[PDB]
Amino acid sequence: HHSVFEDDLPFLEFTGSIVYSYDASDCSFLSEDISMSLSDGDVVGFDMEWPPLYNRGKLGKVALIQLCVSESKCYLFHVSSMSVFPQGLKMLLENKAVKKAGVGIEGDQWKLLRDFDIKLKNFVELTDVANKKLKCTETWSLNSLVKHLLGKQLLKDKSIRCSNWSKFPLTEDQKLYAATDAYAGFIIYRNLEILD
Numbered sequence: 001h002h003s004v005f006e007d008d009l010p011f012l013e014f015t016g017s018i019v020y021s022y023d024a025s026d027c028s029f030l031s032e033d034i035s036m037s038l039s040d041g042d043v044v045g046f047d048m049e050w051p052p053l054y055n056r057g058k059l060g061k062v063a064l065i066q067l068c069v070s071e072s073k074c075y076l077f078h079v080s081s082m083s084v085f086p087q088g089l090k091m092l093l094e095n096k097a098v099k100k101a102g103v104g105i106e107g108d109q110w111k112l113l114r115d116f117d118i119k120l121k122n123f124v125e126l127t128d129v130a131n132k133k134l135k136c137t138e139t140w141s142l143n144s145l146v147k148h149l150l151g152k153q154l155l156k157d158k159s160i161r162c163s164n165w166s167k168f169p170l171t172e173d174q175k176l177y178a179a180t181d182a183y184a185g186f187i188i189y190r191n192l193e194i195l196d
């Protein structure tokens with residue numbers, strides 16, 4: 001048996017516009033569209049994905065970068081398919097003017113630096129924002145925050161989450177999964193920030 005708290009909740013599924021980009025210049029220009037829609041201090045949900053196979057002692061190289069900039073739009077930048085890392089995206093990620101929210105984001109910063117020599121700037125660990133605004137001291141996960149704040153759980157098909165993110169093109173399922181994780185980061189920040 002199990003408590004109500006242990007019940008399976010509805011899955012969180014982003015239903016807004018998912019912009020898929022797999023070319024460097026397209027990506028850079030898209031990053032500028034993002035910059036035109038935001039103002040200093042604004043926060044976007046952040047996440048990234050990498051293939052399952054290990055490479056020379058480390059995790060597969062980052063293949064996808066996701067940015068949810070509003071409740072109705074999320075970008076999927078398939079960098080593994082790009083000839084060069086998009087300059088517009090590098091500057092957006094290194095821009096202190098835009099805040100990037102997520103869980104375990106400090107670890108993303110490290111991997112991003114190792115993989116592309118990019119310095120993620122002005123990121124916020126959602127775990128700390130939650131403990132701060134919810135007035136608690138918990139060890140959160142993106143899933144537990146989605147559950148606590150939204151009453152939903154994250155899609156969990158392991159064959160999708162641990163799929164070959166570097167395989168082009170991404171499947172509709174991969175796109176849904178990746179976009180939704182960044183969307184979660186965006187919504188969680190927004191809902192927490194509004195708290196008095």
Ligand SMILES: [Eu+3]
Pocket residue numbers: 047048181
């Ligand atoms: Eu992640």
Ligand SMILES: [Eu+3]
Pocket residue numbers: 047048049178181
């Ligand atoms: Eu993810």
